[PDB]
Amino acid sequence: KLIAVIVANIDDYFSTELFKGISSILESRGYIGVLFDANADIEREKTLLRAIGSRGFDGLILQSFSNPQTVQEILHQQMPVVSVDREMDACPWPQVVTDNFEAAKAATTAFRQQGYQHVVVLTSELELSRTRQERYRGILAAAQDVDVLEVSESSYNHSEVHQRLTQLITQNDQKTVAFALKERWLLEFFPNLIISGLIDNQTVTATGFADTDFIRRMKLTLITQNPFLMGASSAEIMLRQLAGEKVAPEKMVIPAKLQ
Amino acid sequence: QSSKLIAVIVANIDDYFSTELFKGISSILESRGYIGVLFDANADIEREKTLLRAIGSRGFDGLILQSFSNPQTVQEILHQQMPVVSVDREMDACPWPQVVTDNFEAAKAATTAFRQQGYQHVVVLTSELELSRTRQERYRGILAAAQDVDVLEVSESSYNHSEVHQRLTQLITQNDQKTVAFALKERWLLEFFPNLIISGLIDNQTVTATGFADTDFIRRMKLTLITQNPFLMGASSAEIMLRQLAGEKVAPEKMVIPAKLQE
Numbered sequence: 001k002l003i004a005v006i007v008a009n010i011d012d013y014f015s016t017e018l019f020k021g022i023s024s025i026l027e028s029r030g031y032i033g034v035l036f037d038a039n040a041d042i043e044r045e046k047t048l049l050r051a052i053g054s055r056g057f058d059g060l061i062l063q064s065f066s067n068p069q070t071v072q073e074i075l076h077q078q079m080p081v082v083s084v085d086r087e088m089d090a091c092p093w094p095q096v097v098t099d100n101f102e103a104a105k106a107a108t109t110a111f112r113q114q115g116y117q118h119v120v121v122l123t124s125e126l127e128l129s130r131t132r133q134e135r136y137r138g139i140l141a142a143a144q145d146v147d148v149l150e151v152s153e154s155s156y157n158h159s160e161v162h163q164r165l166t167q168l169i170t171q172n173d174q175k176t177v178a179f180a181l182k183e184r185w186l187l188e189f190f191p192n193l194i195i196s197g198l199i200d201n202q203t204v205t206a207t208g209f210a211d212t213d214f215i216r217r218m219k220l221t222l223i224t225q226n227p228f229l230m231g232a233s234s235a236e237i238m239l240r241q242l243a244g245e246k247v248a249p250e251k252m253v254i255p256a257k258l259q
Numbered sequence: 260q261s262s263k264l265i266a267v268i269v270a271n272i273d274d275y276f277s278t279e280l281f282k283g284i285s286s287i288l289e290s291r292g293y294i295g296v297l298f299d300a301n302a303d304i305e306r307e308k309t310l311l312r313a314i315g316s317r318g319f320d321g322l323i324l325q326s327f328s329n330p331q332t333v334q335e336i337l338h339q340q341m342p343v344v345s346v347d348r349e350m351d352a353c354p355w356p357q358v359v360t361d362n363f364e365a366a367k368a369a370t371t372a373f374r375q376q377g378y379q380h381v382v383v384l385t386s387e388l389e390l391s392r393t394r395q396e397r398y399r400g401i402l403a404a405a406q407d408v409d410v411l412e413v414s415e416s417s418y419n420h421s422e423v424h425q426r427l428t429q430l431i432t433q434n435d436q437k438t439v440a441f442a443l444k445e446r447w448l449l450e451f452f453p454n455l456i457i458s459g460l461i462d463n464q465t466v467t468a469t470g471f472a473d474t475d476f477i478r479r480m481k482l483t484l485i486t487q488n489p490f491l492m493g494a495s496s497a498e499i500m501l502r503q504l505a506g507e508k509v510a511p512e513k514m515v516i517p518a519k520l521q522e
Contacts, residue, residue: 002317010281010297016272023299032313035272035297037285051294055262158479187476195457195480217420218453 021231080241104138123181180208283493342503366400442470
C-alpha cells in the first residue's frame with residue numbers, strides 16, 4: 001500500500017510540506033507515502049516514472065513538469081494519478097491547484113490601494129511553467145506599472161541578479177513593491193534588501209508566494225498556498241481512487257491567503 | 260533481478276540537511292540502476308517503526324538510516340534481511356557501517372577560531388542535549404574551547420517563539436564580553452538569528468553568530484558558518500551501500516566527513 005509522490009525539487013519547502021500533507025491523510029488508512037525527487041530533470045522523472053510503474057506502487061501523486069501524455073506512455077493507466085500545482089491541459093486525472101491568477105491579482109490590487117503603483121516581478125523563467133504565467137497575468141491585470149526580472153534557475157549569478165534588481169526598484173522613485181513569484185527568490189534576495197534599508201515600507205515594500213514561517217518574522221505581507229492542505233486534499237482524492245470510486249478528472253482550487 | 264529500491268529514512272524532511280542528503284544518495288545510486296526512495300520519520304520514533312515494517316514487507320534492497328531507530332529496533336523488525344548504513348548519528352558500538360561528521364572537532368575548532376577574534380562568551384542555542392549524542396558532542400567541543408559558555412535548550416516538542424527569543428537576547432546581553440551566538444542546529448539559526456541581525460544586536464564587533472547550517476540564503480545576510488556537506492555525506496553513504504549490495508562484507512566502522520567552517 002505505497003503511494004509514490006514525485007515532486008519537482010525536494011529542496012523546496014512547498015514540496016516537503018505538500019508531502020507531509022499527503023502522508024498525514026494516507027496514514028488514516030494504513031497507506032504510506034513515498035517521496036521521489038525529480039531533481040528538476042525531465043529525464044530523471046521519466047526513469048522514476050518507469051520504476052514507479054514496474055515496481056507495483058499503488059498510486060501516484062504528481063507535482064511536476066511532464067505532459068500528461070509523457071505520463072500515460074509510461075504508466076498506461078495501471079494506477080490512480082493526481083497532479084498538483086501544475087494546471088495542465090487535457091488532463092485525464094484529478095488536479096489540485098491554487099487560484100494563482102486571482103490571488104496575485106488581489107495582492108497587486110491591495111498594494112496598489114496603498115500607493116505602491118510600481119511592481120517589480122521577480123520570477124523564474126515564465127514559459128517553463130503555467131502557474132508562473134498565471135501569477136504574472138494576475139499582476140498585469142491590476143498593476144499600474146510593471147517591470148519584470150526573469151531568472152533561469154539553471155544558470156544565474158547571485159550578485160548579477162541582485163544588481164539588476166536594485167536597479168528596477170530604484171530607477172524611478174515611484175513607490176515600488178518587489179513581488180517574488182516563487183519562494184526561493186524571496187528568501188535569496190529580500191533579506192539583504194531589508195538590512196540595507198531599500199525595503200523600508202515607505203517607498204519600497206515586498207511580497208510574494210511564500211509559506212515558510214520564518215521569513216515573516218524578519219513584518220511583510222505574503223501570499224500562502226498552504227502546500228500542506230494541497231497535499232492533504234490530493235491524498236483524499238487518491239483515497240477515493242484506491243477505494244475504487246471512479247473519480248472525475250476535474251480541477252480542485254484551494255484558494256490562497258494574503259496574510 | 261530484484262526491486263533495486265533503496266529506502267532512505269530521514270529524521271524530518273523539513274531539514275535541508277535531509278533533502279540534500281537524499282540528493283547525494285540518489286546521484287550515486289543512479290550510476291548502478293538503484294533508486295533512492297525517501298521516507299519521512301517526521302520526528303516520530305513510532306512513525307519510523309511503521310515505516311521500517313513497511314520497508315521490510317515490500318522488498319527494498321537496502322536501508323540508509325538518518326533517523327532515531329537503534330539497532331535493537333532495526334533487528335527486531337527487518338532481521339538483517341537487507342544491508343544497512345547509518346548517517347549523521349554518532350552511535351557508539353554500531354553494528355553497521357556509518358557516515359558521520361567530526362562533531363566534537365568541528366565545534367571545538369569553530370569556537371577556537373571565534374575566540375582568536377575576541378569572542379570569549381559563547382551562547383549555545385540547541386535542541387535538548389540529552390536527546391542526542393551529536394548535539395552533546397558539538398556542545399562538548401565548544402566547552403573544550405571556551406571559558407564563558409551559557410546554554411539555551413529548546414524543546415522541539417513544545418517551545419514558544421518569543422519565549423526562546425527573549426531568553427537568547429538575555430543571555431547574549433548579560434555582560435560585556437564579545438559574544439558568539441552558536442546554534443547547534445540549522446532550524447534555530449534560521450528561526451532566531453535574522454531578527455537579531457535586523458534589530459542590530461548581531462553587529463560583528465561585540466556580538467557575532469555562527470552554527471551548523473548548510474542552506475545558502477542565510478549565507479547572504481556575512482556570517483561565518485559550519486557546513487556538514489550533506490550531499491557528500493549522502494553520496495558517501497550511498498557508495499558504502501553499493502559496496503554492500505555488491506556483496507562486500509563492509510566492516511562496521513565510521514567514515515568521517517569533516518565539516519567545514521566557511522566564511
